[PDB]
């Protein structure tokens, strides 16, 4: 009965095992196991006596690592039934009750082995085991064969989100419940998101060049496969090719076409000349990552991106988390950038501010001034370093005119804007008390940005992001049913009506301005999706340390981000519209494929 | 439903509380407590509306450290409160615990706990769950832990602890969460006799060795505890014939000359100074002393908590039933049980085990043995008096503990046969050396093992196993365990028959040699009791580092020990017959009072 995680389309995706207890009948216990316990302590004053009392505890004794009883310890530590354990393994387990942490074979293997051999010696002294049985047993290593009891192989970011969030708020007891957790995750959309992120980050990586082998002269057993990349040891280097040994022991051949892409990385803004020979790319004993084609007939040299990314997709009517990708791959890093990655949103904040200007009486057609402006020592400048004068409000938004934002921020006031940023889902202590907030200086989580944009997609309401649809107990009884705040209660085909944070006119006008952003500049990239219900805003922070895209239709809000964990420039040429927008495009195109137009 | 400990008369002596869970109805939860949990984490994605709906599923089961499951168990364990009596600061403290009940525990890490708690308090203020005034009041608040003791062991502490510590040793903490009713072999009357005998006997030794000065000087009185009818006090004034001391209740008492005049100063184990002529020679101001009241709290005297330790173990020789156990001067001074854990050298108390083998193969108590000098390599064993008696009968060499005779019998008996016999008598293989020094009592033993050994003499030559559980019942009164001990004599009362480890004649003749030791020898020790069914042997290790007495009747075997935890001399004049024998005498005299003669039987 483990904690089970299901998508919204009823796919079991994860199984989280907690406290384990597999009761056994005293008669089924191997006599050597009973003797191991009987020789575990120097004195007993309850011999025969301890043997009669052991039956009361043999299925409940806590033995470390969530194991209660002898059968649970055999399963957790060795992937064995009690009858499958060696004398050394029975002695190891019998050593644990006294202190399951001081003698744990995982935490303290030397002290555990010390304890185990002490017991083995006692078994010999008591004549429970022979010198041969003793000699064989003492020689034996720890031989732990621990089965992973946390199954998360289909959609790892989704499964982990449930486990880590339940454990964060309610502790380890949350997993011991045996509950069936029914999430809001769309399995189809989750697979799209995973693939879009992986492809998009590999696209960035390939254009930035070959960064060399991940290791040289190290054991191949020390590297793990993931994101369809297989650890390989370079064994031979030719003119146009190279031979390499896999983890199965086979030798593959990478031809020129599979490595010719390898222009050397110099810096974010420079790659060396196209390689002219295999020797400029690989050395023998180098550890490379390879990827086969669909057939497994050809292999190419690939690279795991150093850059990171994320994707978060929510339903704008209720805040349902439809797809979540926290990084390039869950094995690489368990950290979920959609929920834990604090970054500056850049110009993706501008729609929040421009909505306040619409709220206070302006329209998308209202004339605004794109001119120089100074506030103390601060002289905000546009990306292009040019000024356009009197332009309509919408031109200022689709062209990210910094001076206009700062001017609107003067007109509307910092406090009204900070209060508005909060109502859109941002954090009080993360929003500065100055005029730089108009440019997107606050620290945000991509999930908060999706919360914000949902307001445009749903008619001006604040929704709350949620991942649980319902929880059932092991016996199929519904014990929790999500009661989300709805923007539009009639749209569902009752309960909690979401608060209106913008006038309908303001969410509507902003949604149309954002659709214009897509039907012009970025834009010319996004309109490659043959759909007329899409709106969005690109963003780039100072020196391209972040590339963002936040966009929607009336049924789905997606926020994509690309950047390095330790903030570095992505490269001169790498605006939001270039690095993040492609991921957003592949996701939205496939996610929305075969659904009618859905607008505000 | 806690682990309950009962004596052999069905009287409750101890209660050990395990995992606690006091389920409450979500509606009964103060809204501020819900808000504390709601502000415990920075973000929630299940404002904080959905966490509020999901909290009902976990609010009674969340593990919150120190065996507390659910909010009501944490309120009870940490503060001795109901959820509704908790302050905003106490609700914030508890709400901080689920994430890591060890990293944020207020008992283990009060600094990291308070840091966490105030972080939550700040969040509650930011979210508008509490006001600036509620906030200010709450942050100002200390941890204020008021933890109720859930381990009640106030009647016979060494007995109660024996059950808890032994169950936890063999089966872990899960043994106490069982709600089980443990029916022990402990005789309540005999347990009280043993406790008193030990306390009195150790105080007798202590008083004759002199005043060793105050327990501490210039230390906080809150750091000291009352036990063994001794109360810690701080000297506040020093007069000519009297002094003033501040008690832990805040009262100031006066100790008159009669209550301190006994205080001859301790010079060393073998010397005490002259009788004090003034209160200033005994106490200083800020000195931490021990005071005792008489019948009624009208007068107080200066007492001293012994540095010396002791123990008493009493078993039934027919089945090994543990009737009385005292592990030290007092359980509240040291939780260590010297009867079960105190490894010491038995000295001359081992001699009857060796001399029984000589009788077994088949010498008699009258057989002539040689008390002359002996050398084995570089080792030259010498007798206590440093003199030799020549050819003497076996019984005289045993009574007089003639080391040379023991060593000589050890060659006649052989090391391995003796080591086997010692192991057969209840001793540990790895604790018995492989040399001729074992004849002198060099192995490391537990007093319980010595009682196991001596039971063999009392029961006719059978090996019994010491046991403390008679039966175990579950919380619903169902019997889940019923002790099936090995019996020396089944008609004397499954039934299980104990193995014979000695000829009846050898057990019978040794028991009679041991009776003569107490009756004709040891300055008429049985004539101090007034019984004819007692046998026993005194023991003293090198430099009086240990004082032992092992003795019996056909129905009770008692072993007493006196010595210092860090082995030091008890004094030149401090043999077994001096230190341990008086405790053994008070216990046996009272324990056996009004029971007919009970001696060993000879089955030839
Ligand atoms: C807002 O983000 C503001 C400057 N604006 C943008 O970079 N806006 S964008 O919407 O991200 N965006 N602009 C462009 C673009 C296109 C061009 O042709 C030229 O010449 C210039 N910019 N693109 C590319 C696509 O449209 C494809 O053509 C966009 O995606 N940002 C700032 O104020 C901050 N940094 O700005 C830098 C990067 C220095 C800049 O202006 O270049 C900023 C805000 S908060 C913070 N830490 N930094
Ligand atoms: C045995 O323990 C052995 C020497 N024998 C004893 O000490 N026997 S006794 O039974 O403990 N015991 N002896 C005496 C006694 C009385 C005297 O008048 C004189 O002169 C000497 N001894 N008493 C007095 C009582 O009858 C008064 O009521 C006894 O109780 N011990 C040893 O072999 C060890 N050390 O030897 C010395 C230091 C010489 C010693 O015992 O004094 C020894 C054995 S194991 C170890 N670590 N040391």
TrEMBL record, chain A:
Protein encoded by which gene: ponA
Main location: membrane
Part of the intact protein present: 52 to 757 of 851
Domain Penicillin-binding protein transpeptidase: 312-580
Membrane-related topology note: Single-pass type II membrane protein
Organism: Acinetobacter baumannii
Domain Penicillin-binding protein OB-like, residue spans: 209-307
Protein name in UniProt: Penicillin-binding protein 1A
Chemical reaction(s) catalysed: [GlcNAc-(1->4)-Mur2Ac(oyl-L-Ala-gamma-D-Glu-L-Lys-D-Ala-D-Ala)](n)-di-trans,octa-cis-undecaprenyl diphosphate + beta-D-GlcNAc-(1->4)-Mur2Ac(oyl-L-Ala-gamma-D-Glu-L-Lys-D-Ala-D-Ala)-di-trans,octa-cis-undecaprenyl diphosphate = [GlcNAc-(1->4)-Mur2Ac(oyl-L-Ala-gamma-D-Glu-L-Lys-D-Ala-D-Ala)](n+1)-di-trans,octa-cis-undecaprenyl diphosphate + di-trans,octa-cis-undecaprenyl diphosphate + H(+); Preferential cleavage: (Ac)2-L-Lys-D-Ala-|-D-Ala. Also transpeptidation of peptidyl-alanyl moieties that are N-acyl substituents of D-alanine
Job description of the protein: Cell wall formation. Synthesis of cross-linked peptidoglycan from the lipid intermediates. The enzyme has a penicillin-insensitive transglycosylase N-terminal domain (formation of linear glycan strands) and a penicillin-sensitive transpeptidase C-terminal domain (cross-linking of the peptide subunits).
Pathway per the UniProt entry: Glycan biosynthesis; Cell wall biogenesis; peptidoglycan biosynthesis
One Gene Ontology MF term: penicillin binding
């Amino acid at each position: 009965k483990p904690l089970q995680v299901y998508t919204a389309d009823n796919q079991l995706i994860a199984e989280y095992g907690g406290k384990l207890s597999i009761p056994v009948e005293y008669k089924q216990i191997p006599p050597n196991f009973i003797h191991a316990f009987l020789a575990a302590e120097d004195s007993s004053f309850f011999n025969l006596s301890k043997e009669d009392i052991l039956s009361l505890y043999v299925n409940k004794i806590f033995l470390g690592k969530n194991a209660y009883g002898i059968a649970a310890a055999a399963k957790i530590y060795y992937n064995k039934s009690i009858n499958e354990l060696s004398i050394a393994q029975m002695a190891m387990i019998a050593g644990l009750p006294k202190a399951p942490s001081k003698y744990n074979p995982v935490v303290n293997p030397e002290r555990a082995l010390e304890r185990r051999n002490w017991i083995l010696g006692r078994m010999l002294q008591l004549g429970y085991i022979s010198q041969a049985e003793y000699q064989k047993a003492v020689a034996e290593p720890i031989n732990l064969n621990m089965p992973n009891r946390d199954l998360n192989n289909i959609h790892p970011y989704a499964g982990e989100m449930v486990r880590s969030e339940l454990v964060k708020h309610f502790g380890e007891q949350a997993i011991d419940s045996g509950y069936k957790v029914y999430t809001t995750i769309n399995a189809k959309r989750q697979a799209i998101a995973e693939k879009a992120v992986q492809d998009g980050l590999e696209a960035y990586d390939r254009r930035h060049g070959w960064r060399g082998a991940e290791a040289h002269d190290k054991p191949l057993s020390e590297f793990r496969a993931y994101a369809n990349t297989y650890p390989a040891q370079v064994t031979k280097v030719n003119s146009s090719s190279f031979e390499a040994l896999m983890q199965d022991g086979s030798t593959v051949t990478v031809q020129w076409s599979g490595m010719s892409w390898a222009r050397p990385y110099r810096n974010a803004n420079s790659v060396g000349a196209a390689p002219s020979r295999a020797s400029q790319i690989v050395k023998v004993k180098d550890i490379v990552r390879l990827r086969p084609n669909e057939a497994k007939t050809a292999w190419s040299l690939v690279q795991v991106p150093k850059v990171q990314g994320q994707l978060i997709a929510i339903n704008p009517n209720d805040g349902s988390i439809e797809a979540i990708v926290g990084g390039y791959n869950f094995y690489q890093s368990k950290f979920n950038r959609a929920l834990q990655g604090w970054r500056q949103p850049g110009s993706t904040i501008k729609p929040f501010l421009y909505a306040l200007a619409l709220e206070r009486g302006m329209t998308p057609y209202s004339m605004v001034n794109d001119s120089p402006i100074t506030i103390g020592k601060w002289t905000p400048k546009n990306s292009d370093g040019r000024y356009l004068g009197m332009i309509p409000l919408r031109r200022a938004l689709y062209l990210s005119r910094n001076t206009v934002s700062v001017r609107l921020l003067q007109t509307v006031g910092i406090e009204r804007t900070r209060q508005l940023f909060m109502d859109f889902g941002l954090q009080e202590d993360q929003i500065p008390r100055n005029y730089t907030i108009a440019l997107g200086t606050p620290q945000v989580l991509p999930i908060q940005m999706a919360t914000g944009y949902a307001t445009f997609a749903n008619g001006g309401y604040r929704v709350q992001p949620h991942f649980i649809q319902r929880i059932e107990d092991a016996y199929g009884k519904v014990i929790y049913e999500a009661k989300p705040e709805y923007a539009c209660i009639p749209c569902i085909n009752q309960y909690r009506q979401a608060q209106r944070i913008l006038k309908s006119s303001s969410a509507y006008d902003m949604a149309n301005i954002l659709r214009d952003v897509i039907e012009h500049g970025t834009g010319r990239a996004a309109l490659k999706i043959g759909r007329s219900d899409l709106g969005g805003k690109t963003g780039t922070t100072n020196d391209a340390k972040d590339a963002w895209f936040a966009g929607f239709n009336g049924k789905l809000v997606t926020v994509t981000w690309v950047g390095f964990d330790q903030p570095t420039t992505l490269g001169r040429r790498e605006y939001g519209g270039i690095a993040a927008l492609p991921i957003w495009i592949n996701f939205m195109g496939q996610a929305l494929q075969g659904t009618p137009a859905a607008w505000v």
